Design a protein around this ligand. Structure first.
Ligand code: GTP
Ligand code: GTP
Ligand code: GDP
Ligand code: GDP
Ligand code: MG
Ligand code: MG
Ligand code: ZN
Ligand code: ZN
Ligand code: ZN
Lengths: 48, 54, 429, 53, 429, 49, 430, 429
């Protein structure tokens, strides 16, 4: 059982707080998928 | 008291309060605060072997 | 020979609904009303509880009463709810308010005229009225108050007629009411004065018998009323069906009531066993008597070992041997002399009905005039006295015009009841 | 990486995708009557008598 | 039939009414256009096929009324029953009661008259206001006394929001509360406490909300109101009414200021990590942290609790929770109320308002508990009143509006009499 | 005829066991229900379906 | 029922609880997310959604380890509440953890404990895992032990305490902390369990043959011991015992309840399948001072009551034979007034190994909870350190500036001296 | 001649479960209670241990007792666990804690109410109760405490009825409890007065018998319970089956108890032989008697060679006449006169049954009232005094209502029994 290896496989790319992950992401490639088109400053899905 | 010091000796009491008589009594200005208290606004080593009293 | 029944209030109506379920099932009557039995004996004495209609329907001789109409949709929503006459449903806009004063003097009075009209209709259509039966709870407003008013008016025109009352005495542990002692105390004296006999059913005891003996996980109000319905079906078995030693309500009253004010009994049913313990039980009298005289079988939460049995009545139903049903009682009288009053020998009256309840080969209902009945009246009397001492919840009764004296009068009458039970228990030869 | 991530969290991750690691148990002493012991009607104290009466 | 007229007064009343009617529309499946009669107590069935709320939104400031008129439920709300003034009371009890209140209650009573004629079995009025401001306190007092003098003994339920013991969005707020306590004591059958700090504490702790708001506070208030009214709205084993629980809750006419609490009140993440059983929710109710009023019951004595269970709750579990509460010594019931418990059963779980914080729950319970601990908030408020009135602060505002100086002394002394009454009821005989 | 009586008693006892085991009351099932009773269950409500 | 609430105090308690609950989830077949793909009632509670919630209260005065648990794998297993974290640590100060910052958090901890206990209909008691060396585990541990004693009466209290070992010690004032917390461990704890660190380190260095074993390994061993103790009431067995049975069989006098622990057979994978690990062999290893988790030399004292929890394929033949061999072994000696001195409990469940751990799959095992008079020497080391520190008021200003007075230290020292004296008296022959 | 059985503690429950396994196997009963025997002699006296339901299922007349419901669950889930009545299992919330005080005064005393309820039900259902049966261990808490409490409160109700107890006497060589001497001492003085005759079991001797005679590599509690069950079935061989020379429990008491206090017997079984020597052993009754009087074959760990036999009883089963059951008794009497007592001629009574245990063509059960039975009473006496002098493990007992005076009285009574045994051993004609 390679604890460090499975840690790199899963824990390193795990996300615990998606709120924080979106708010202040670093060199993270996981959890960046947020609401698709839900947040537009215009407040409406219509074109600006 | 004995050789072993009591909880009250250490400064803590393992006794259930009498809710019926004391705890469950509501506090009011007249009746509690006026005789022996202030206003409702927001704000030991007792060893029988030694001179302290349990 | 035929009796007319009335259900009062939410509890009374819901108990009577399933009582009529049991009666119709036992007489082979459809939930709609048509007869679908397979025996002549079912139709032989169907007039005891039912009346034949124009189209051959069988309508129960039942009067439904409640100040709350919001709970009288459930009585017709029950599986047998469409059995009753639409004109026997009597309703008021607002509820009794859990107020004996409202149910007896102000709201019930405006509603009692139509109820008595329906009762007089039933009595006049009735050929030879054996009695009036009532099902209600003393802890409510329109069950205690309106029920006591109903029986009081019933005595005014039917003095000698048997007044059965299956009163539901509320218990402190399963209590859900604060004016519970007030209603119970205000209704107990009216029950004493205006009821030939009155058996007390306690919700705590019903819950316990369903919880331990039946062991079934979820006995709801329906399951509690099932036992009361079975007891009501068994108390009138000999009026409707032939038997080796039959009886009727008057005959039980004569053999159970030694003095006019001593007419409060304990109810018991047998057999009652769990699903799991079903293979393991023997179906005989040598097991029915054990369950019947057992402490846990009583539907009243006051253990019969407190006092001594004034009188006992055993309505056995099914295929029994008469000497084996009487020598069991002889043995219990012979060997339990401490719990039977000495100056009244042969305290147990046994009666035999040939036809058992549907689905049961043999059963028995118990009626006991034990002096332990004072226990429930006491344990609610201390509650009533504690409530009354500080004048708690009296404005809700004096706003209807009812004066504070009647509380003391009810206390006096109830204390007299308890005192006479105690004195007759302690009486010596 | 944390030491707990290396040991404890790694063991948990291994357990996620290897269900055979769970050992068989024989809790025959726990049964229907033990579950019935948990029934809340016990705390209601139905038809119970004390010295106070 | 079984109607209930909801009168919202002032800005706080307006927002709590918005939340309440949102919740009621969600429960009854009513779109914001008006498109079994469980809705009859809240939605009058219009002759045009829609459902109009039996509510009156009254406010002297036109802003909130115009916001409602131009919001989402415009087609739901009647263009009348939506009364708006031209200038507010400016957080002045004198302005709300004697100057601007007098000139608008004349038509407010006309609107209430129309609502009453629309009703046929009106159970009573539920008033929603905060005594902190002018319209909520002054106009609320005037409207309460006019309703009392006009409709006689109709039930009145003032779900009042007194100033919280620590935070307050006004400085004349203790003055307004002390001035309005006379009306809330004389012309209100049941007064319920809905302070803001306790609801903030529930939203912060149980709901894990970092930034609670009036939105969440009003959602919780609507949850409580719906929980209490669902007994007459929907079915249940134990259906109770307004006068029913008034009788089972209020022991003395002067003793009607009651506390409220709700459980389980948890978020979606919290919901599936707990056993939301009846015993657990009842314990959460009886714990101080679960109340909608900052008033620890353990600091006082319980006098009468009315539990309102919705969902899969069974009388079995109700009685089990009641037993484990009675056997629990951290809360003391008063000596003259042995039972002290009223129980209502409801078979519809509370529908959650989307976009809020409550989670889909299978069972909930709301407790309306009259206890002697209510003296704490009264001592708080009249200590503020004495501190401010020691040197006559902000009294010129009240005086120049036609309200004399003896007002403050008489209102403070009525509040002190209430202090003594609540001490005396809880004091052991 | 004594043997016959014993056989009849045994058969009736087995019928009793069968009926009690299949009984709605002991099995917490509502076999018989009405059109209104399906929607509204005030007394017979045991739990969520 | 047979529930048992696990209260973890301090960093040591939190990590020990992490190991204990991973082992419990593995044993009961519960995913680290809390779901299952009913003896778990003793440790886990169902939910309407169908998942399981542990019967634990993690409590720390500082949020590092608690937040690390919240961000760990078992975040979905552990309830969002019952995971109480304060804002600032006790900073290795008993006074700070008991009088200033523990006061503002013990109320919330007790509310959580009451909420946990309300769901338990037959709660046997509380197992409190902590290290009295640290400030939090000493101060807040003692405070919570008091409040539990006054809140639940005579409920069972198994205090698994990690005393500071005589030679290896990671703190300079933990002698002060343990001297101060000996009152709680002596009065408000039904059975105190010694779990020092050097003995576990030595047992792992020799009997398990791994170069660098750590706090994870020692916590795994502690969790194995706790699981062995609780398996009697969780699973089947020839001699089932409960938490209220071995207390009676182990505690001769109410104030003599400090007991040593030992475990066998602790072997590696290489050592697993080369020796016939018989029950007699494992019992001999247990009674050997090598197999102990606390270094109280048997020969320096006398055993008063030994409780032996056997797990696996152990038949009473082998248990009785091992007991007879132990009795006839003259190297160890029992106290004169307790002839039997043996409590035995057999469980059918074999030992369970956690993947990634250091133990090996063994078909049988045995754990000893031994009350012996030799335990006076750890207290002798403790107060020999305490008086040396306390001779001229060393590190005492930190304590006296946080709420406690000077009399607390002297009175605790007198309590420790009396704990020496009564142990010597019960060891004295009649 | 009914024997109503009871099991106490987990030891007693397992022993009784194995005993019912053996009895059902002998009488041809499946775990479901149905009968599939090869002869009607089983049903002829099947009543003695089983009761027949009206459905034909045979249910043991046994009452199970343990404060831990886990023991009830294990017994119910055992191979023959479905045989017992579901309501015949009685359980508590918390175990005895291996404490005689808890099992006899505080926790056991509470549950004996239901224990006596079911026990009296079963005992009365008997047509003619020959005796009560008990299986327990004196080294535990539930068996030592609750068992003695049950026998005490059963002697008061059935004075002349025979009282079997099979108490597992613990030994330090097989010690697994430290409150072992306390519990043994507290139970012996109760069994002296409350048991008319009682024979003791030692796991030491059972283990020795299994190791040397049966030569089982891994003897288990199942094997020990099977031995005890076979001999406990053989003690009632004449009761359950016809024989040449019948005997009953009262007969055994009369012929084995010379004085009321001396009723503690030492017991055994025969034939016993290893698996590999069954076909080599010539089963003759002389060999049966040789093994029967062999010291190692005794299932109580005390050598008879250090004492003398007050009385002996040999219940032989199988096709066999009277000289193999009397003439070898004469032989052993003559050639072991030092091993017997002079002032009691014919120390050994013989009983003959015509039905041997299945799997054997003849067998014998031995019950001996040897004067060496007091050696264990000695050793337990100084064991008890060892902790009593130092007051060790006494706070657990004293905290549950018991006092040091009870311990002193128990030790005095045990010492008096020991002295009586010794003086009757060394007494001269
Ligand atoms: N719960 C709740 N309380 C509110 C809300 N809005 C105002 N309040 C209460 O109202 C009190 C102050 O009064 P106002 O906000 O001025 O409202 P008002 O009582 O009608 O007074 P006027 O604005 O002069 O009409 C505060 O102490 C709040 O507690 C709300 O949206 N929710
Ligand atoms: N056996 C064991 N002991 C530990 C572990 N972690 C910490 N300890 C003990 O904790 C002691 C040091 O105390 P601290 O560093 O203050 O930790 P604490 O006891 O939780 O106290 P706080 O830090 O204030 O929370 C050491 O002597 C260890 O014995 C662990 O994982 N296993
Ligand atoms: N056994 C039984 N008791 C009931 C039932 N319904 C109500 N009760 C009891 O009656 C009390 C309420 O009385 P209620 O029916 O409201 O009186 P009413 O207002 O006059 O109809 C409660 O305490 C219940 O315990 C029922 O169906 N069965
Ligand atoms: N023969 C036999 N003896 C047993 C069995 N189980 C336990 N014992 C003995 O019973 C004693 C312990 O009894 P205990 O379990 O404490 O009794 P309890 O406290 O009433 O449950 C031990 O000394 C064992 O030797 C069994 O299955 N067979
Ligand atoms: Mg405004
Ligand atoms: Mg720390
Ligand atoms: Zn203390
Ligand atoms: Zn102040
Ligand atoms: Zn002291």
């Amino acid at each position: 059982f390679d604890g460090e290896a499975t840690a790199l496989e899963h824990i390193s790319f795990d996300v615990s707080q998606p709120e924080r992950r979106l708010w202040q992401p670093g060199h993270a490639t996981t959890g960046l998928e947020g609401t698709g088109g839900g947040s537009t400053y215009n407040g409406v899905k219509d074109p600006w | 008291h004995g050789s072993y010091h009591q909880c009250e000796c250490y400064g803590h009491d393992t006794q259930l309060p009498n809710y019926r008589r004391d705890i469950s009594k509501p506090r009011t200005l007249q009746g509690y605060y006026a005789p022996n208290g202030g206003c409702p606004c927001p704000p030991g080593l007792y060893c029988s072997v030694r001179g302290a009293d349990t | 020979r035929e009796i007319v029944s009335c259900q009062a209030g939410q509890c009374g109506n819901q108990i009577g609904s399933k009582f009529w379920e049991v009666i119709s099932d036992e007489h082979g009557v459809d939930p709609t009303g048509t007869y679908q039995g397979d025996s002549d004996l079912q139709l032989e004495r169907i007039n005891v509880y039912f009346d034949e209609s124009s189209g051959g329907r069988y309508v129960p001789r039942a009067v439904l009463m409640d100040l709350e109409p919001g709970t009288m949709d459930s009585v017709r929503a029950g599986p047998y709810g469409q059995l009753f006459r639409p004109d026997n449903f009597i309703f008021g806009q607002s509820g009794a308010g859990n107020n004996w004063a409202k149910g007896h003097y102000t709201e019930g009075a405006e509603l009692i005229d139509s109820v008595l009209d329906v009762c007089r209709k039933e009595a006049e259509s009735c050929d030879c009225l054996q009695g009036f039966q009532l099902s209600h709870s003393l802890g409510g407003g329109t069950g205690s108050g309106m029920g006591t008013l109903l029986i009081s008016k019933l005595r005014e025109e039917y003095p000698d007629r048997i007044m059965m009352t299956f009163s539901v005495i509320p218990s402190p542990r399963v209590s859900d009411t604060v004016v519970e002692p007030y209603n119970t105390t205000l209704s107990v004296h009216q029950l004493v004065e205006n009821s030939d006999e009155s058996m007390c059913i306690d919700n705590e005891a019903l819950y316990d018998i369903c919880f331990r003996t039946l062991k079934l996980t979820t006995p709801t109000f329906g399951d509690l009323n099932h036992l009361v319905a079975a007891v009501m079906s068994g108390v009138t078995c000999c009026l409707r069906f032939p038997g080796q030693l039959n009886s009727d309500l008057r005959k039980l009253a004569v053999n159970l009531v030694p003095f006019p004010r001593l007419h409060f009994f304990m109810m018991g049913f047998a057999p009652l066993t769990s699903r799991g313990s079903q293979q393991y039980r023997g179906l005989s009298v040598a097991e029915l008597t054990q369950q019947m005289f057992d402490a846990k079988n009583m539907m009243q939460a006051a253990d019969p070992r407190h006092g001594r049995y004034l009188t006992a009545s055993a309505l056995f139903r099914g295929r029994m041997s008469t000497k084996e049903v009487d020598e069991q009682m002889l043995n219990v009288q012979n060997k339990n002399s401490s719990y039977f009053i000495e100056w009244i020998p042969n305290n147990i009256k046994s009666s035999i009905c040939d036809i058992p309840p549907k689905g049961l080969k043999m059963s028995v209902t118990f009626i006991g005039n034990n002096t332990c009945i004072q226990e429930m009246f006491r344990r609610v009397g201390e509650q009533f006295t504690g409530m009354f001492r500080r004048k708690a919840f009296l404005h809700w009764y004096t706003g209807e015009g009812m004066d504070e004296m009647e509380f003391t009068e009810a206390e006096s009458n109830m204390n007299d009841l308890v005192s006479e039970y105690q004195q007759y228990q302690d009486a010596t030869v | 990486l944390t030491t707990k991530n290396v040991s404890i969290d790694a063991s948990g991750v291994y357990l996620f995708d290897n269900l055979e690691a769970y050992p068989l148990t024989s809790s025959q002493c726990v049964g229907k009557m033990t579950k019935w012991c948990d029934n809340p009607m016990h705390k209601t104290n139905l038809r119970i008598h004390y010295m106070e009466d | 039939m079984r109607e209930a007229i909801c009168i919202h007064i002032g800005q706080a009343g307006c927002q709590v009414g918005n939340a309440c009617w949102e919740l009621f529309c969600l429960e009854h499946g009513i779109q914001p256009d008006g498109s079994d009669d469980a809705f009859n107590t809240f939605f009058s069935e219009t002759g045009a096929g829609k459902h109009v709320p039996r509510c009156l939104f009254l406010d002297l400031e036109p802003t909130v009324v115009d916001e409602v008129r131009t919001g989402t439920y415009r087609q739901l709300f009647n263009p009348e029953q939506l009364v708006s003034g031209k200038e507010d009371a400016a957080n002045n009890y004198a302005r709300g009661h004697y100057t601007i209140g007098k000139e608008i209650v004349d038509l407010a009573l006309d609107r209430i008259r129309k609502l009453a004629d629309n009703c046929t079995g009106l159970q009573g009025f539920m008033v929603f206001h905060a005594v902190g401001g002018g319209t909520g306190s002054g106009l609320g007092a005037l409207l309460l006394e006019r309703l009392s003098v006009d409709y006689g003994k109709k039930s009145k339920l003032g779900y009042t929001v007194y100033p919280s013991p620590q935070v307050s969005t006004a400085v004349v707020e203790p003055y307004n509360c002390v001035l309005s306590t006379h009306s809330l004591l004389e012309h209100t059958d049941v007064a319920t406490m809905l302070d803001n700090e306790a609801i903030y504490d529930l939203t912060r702790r149980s709901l894990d909300i970092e930034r609670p708001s009036y939105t969440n506070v009003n959602r919780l208030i609507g949850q409580v109101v719906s929980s209490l009214t669902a007994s007459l709205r929907f079915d249940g084993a134990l259906n109770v009414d307004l006068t029913e629980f008034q009788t089972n809750l209020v022991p003395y006419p002067r003793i009607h200021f009651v506390l409220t609490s709700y459980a389980p009140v948890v978020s979606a993440e919290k919901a599936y990590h707990e056993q939301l059983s009846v015993a657990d929710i009842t314990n959460s109710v009886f714990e101080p942290a679960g109340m909608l009023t900052k008033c620890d019951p353990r600091h006082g004595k319980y006098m009468s609790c009315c539990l309102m269970y919705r969902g899969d709750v069974v009388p079995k579990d109700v009685n089990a929770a009641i037993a484990t509460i009675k056997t629990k010594r951290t809360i003391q019931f008063v000596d003259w109320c042995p039972t002290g418990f009223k129980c209502g059963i409801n078979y519809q779980p509370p529908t959650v308002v989307p976009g809020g914080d409550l989670a889909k729950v299978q069972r909930a319970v709301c407790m309306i508990a009259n206890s002697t601990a209510i003296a704490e908030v009264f001592a708080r408020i009249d200590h503020k009143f004495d501190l401010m009135y020691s040197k006559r602060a902000f009294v010129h505002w009240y005086v120049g509006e036609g309200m004399e100086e003896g007002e403050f002394s008489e209102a403070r002394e009525d509040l002190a009499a209430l202090e003594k009454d609540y001490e005396e009821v809880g004091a052991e005989s | 005829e004594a043997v016959r009586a014993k056989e009849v008693d045994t058969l009736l006892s087995l019928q009793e066991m069968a009926y009690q085991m299949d009984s709605d009351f002991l099995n917490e099932r509502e076999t018989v229900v009405s059109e209104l009773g399906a929607s509204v269950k005030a007394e017979r409500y045991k739990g969520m379906s």
